[model samples]
Target: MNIFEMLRIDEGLRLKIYKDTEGYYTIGIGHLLTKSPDLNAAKSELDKAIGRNCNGVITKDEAEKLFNQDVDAAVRGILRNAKLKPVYDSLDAVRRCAAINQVFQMGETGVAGFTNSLRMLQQKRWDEAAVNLAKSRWYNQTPDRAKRVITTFRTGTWDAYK
Candidate 1:
């Protein structure tokens, strides 16, 4: 399956606005709409992207499409970051998804803050890379997710997501 599909399984599809674990006002699969600038801009750009409407709730299609947009942005953020780009480029497809998974949860800038771990990844030291990430605050914040993401990095497999 594709990364987005894998993320949908992880993030789940929610049509109504809900509080993410961080207490942000998020909608759709994982759209954190904090204000009109955040909300309206999405309502505007969302429809244009998927060729979409909603107030409090949306159809599953809208949620899925919005999720795709978020995943696409996550990838773009990874590509544009000087620190992460080379590391991302160094991985196989399955392992690349793990990188994107890290950025998807922590933001590209935050993941790059994992300086030593990235070097380990670029060097293909999977065990060391996973071990370093396991020692992060991000790891404790959500053990379920961190375990899966780290497992993917350590093993270069999609089985963790499954």
Candidate 2:
């Protein structure tokens, strides 16, 4: 499956706004309703949709499209960062998507703090990168996601969690 589909499965497809585990207002497969410019723009679009009498809830298709847009932006942001570009560009598609997924959850700057992991990635040390990733606080907070990304790093394939 595609990365977005995999993310939908990982994040769960939610149509209504709800508080995520971290207490952030989120909707449409983990789109955090924060102060980010993209989120503000999406909120403006949502308000317009609500003004059109579509009700407060969006359709699954609409949610999916919005989620894809957000994901694309997040990946673009990661790629645009000079510090991360080399590490990101060196990976295969699956590993690249995994890195994008990480940057989506944690901003590009946040992921950049994983200094050893990024160094391992830059050096094309897949196994070492996976190990470094597993040693992070992000892994401690979300072992399931860490495992998925680590698996992708190790094998260069998306092994959907059962």
Candidate 3:
């Protein structure tokens, strides 16, 4: 299946954990880190699997193992490393966006989408959040569409960049 289909199906699947000096970002299955301590190796491996500089992809098995091996160390590495932080943060946002999209598909108001997208924007995953929000059918106004237009003005790019 394509990314859209995968997003629809994965739903709440936890993908990764990321941190910045500002704080840590966590949710859903990504919370597995709370159960382990050896996060260094896990974070290192995740940094490689999901490219430190870009929003690269990783398999579910890879993510699970990384979380299982050393949760604290990995989270620390993520928090300390600037290069890896954004990528990891984006992955977390993607997972949240997918979960929200699944809710939208179920005929709900897609409130999750709007809230999750806002989280993504806070993490600087501006493009991803804009795209997900635009796809959502909730909100009194087209917040996602508005975000997209603003993003285009600032970055000269669109959702296709994702």
Candidate 4:
């Protein structure tokens, strides 16, 4: 069951506390793993609420304050974790493959491959791209692509933007 269901709140200070805690955990974890801009923004806004400094590292009291600020967002972040990594990994593989394919495939073929891979991405053919990209030996652009894909995935496009 959902946290809201588990908590069974009817709009009180406790609910607010739960909500804030949830947001803190979600944003903190998101920053730790992917460093997402939205999570960073959330963290910043939350730190302000808790009267913390700019680095986002807060004291125990600050953490407690955040815990009392938003739990719903934490729950939502957990739900989003399922698809975000997979989509990011797939797109990253595609870009890496494109970079390697460029080495031996010549200009047009390389560009064609890149275009096709992106088309597959745009079409949401994630599995196909993942397989093909993984079959190749490529690595140069993998990190950048992975970050981009992760960012895009987390921003609500991994499943809904087709």
Candidate 5:
């Protein structure tokens, strides 16, 4: 399988700028800080994708290429975070994806801040975990997306957001 496919599996395709794990501005499939040669390349491709000068936007194709360039390092960061790995490994794909997505957004330390949620997840207490997740500031900050993740955690279904 191609790396892009794998990244699409791990991180759902995104084309717009968003805050990444450490709260840095990221775009085009997780290109962080927009400071690398890889990002320059993605910007060049984005220029072609939109038929204009680069303007911090990208098409899905450009996003996939950008993600492919840096996904391995991202995965390695997730895998190496000792605080996150045990809990990460204990869950099913739907829940696992939710956890990884949270880490992607908030970083390992940020996820660790959800002490009650993490405890509930570790215990496989899906219902309580959902409640704990909803109680967090993260949920308050982004209620819609947090609800989707909490629903996935509770029901083990990927369609919570769908």
Candidate 6:
């Protein structure tokens, strides 16, 4: 499956406004509205997603478009990291997905801080890399997501969730 599809399962595609694990206003595949205060596209969508008491909803097309935009930036962000490039490049297709999954969830600084894990990944030490991933706040905060990511890293397979 594509990374986006994997994320649909992991992130859960929701159009309605719901508080994230961090209690922030979010919608459309973990989209966070707290990052901005304006009312244009995302802002407009966010504002609409939360109506009175303020819980609004986005359209299916809007969600899909937002997912594409989010993933596009996410993928680019991971690649944009200078330190992560070599290590990410060293991984095979499946393992690469593991790396992408990591940065996708944690963002730049989070995965960039995984020096030990990156080293293990570069050296092709699958289990060791996954071990390092398990020993993180990210894992504790989202054990389920981390579990699948770790297993994907360790086994180079997307079937972990199943």
TM-score for each candidate, following the candidate numbering? 0.86, 0.83, 0.21, 0.22, 0.66, 0.84
- Lowest summed lDDT across 10 adjacent residues in model 1 is found at 44-53
Find the candidate with the highest TM-score and give its number.
Answer: 1
Candidate structures ordered by TM-score, highest first:
1, 6, 2, 5, 4, 3
- Writing each residue's lDDT as its tens digit, candidate 5 over 67-106 gives 6555555556767877667777888777776775666555
Q: Can you write out model 3's per-residue Cα lDDT over 77-123, one digit (the tens) per residue?
A: 54455543453455443443333332322222333435565466556
Residue-level lDDT of model 2, residues 1-162, one tens digit each, is 667866776688788766665666577787776543454554655656435433346788877777878788988887788888888888878788787778777776575478788888878888888888888788898888778878877878766443
**Number of the top lDDT candidate:** 1
Considering lDDT, where higher is better, how would the candidates rank from best to worst? 1, 6, 2, 5, 3, 4
Tens digits of per-residue lDDT, candidate 1, 1-162, equal: 667766776677777767677776677777766534355564554455445455567788777777777889999988998899999999999899888877876786566469999999999999999899889888888889889888989998777866
Q: What C-alpha RMSD separates each model from the true structure?
A: 3.1, 3.7, 15.8, 15.6, 6.3, 4.1
lDDT of 3 at 88: 44
Q: Which residues of candidate 6, in runs, are more than 4 Å off?
A: 35-55
- Candidate 6 local lDDT, 22-68, one digit each (tens): 66667888777664433344456565544423236777777787678
lDDT of 1: 0.78
Candidate 6 has a TM-score of: 0.84
Candidate 1 matches the true fold with a TM-score of 0.86
Enumerate residue pairs that collide in model 6. Answer: 49-56, 50-54, 50-55, 50-56, 51-54, 51-55, 51-56
Model 3 local distance difference test score: 0.42
Evaluate residue 71 in candidate 5 and report its C-alpha lDDT on the 0 to 100 scale.
53
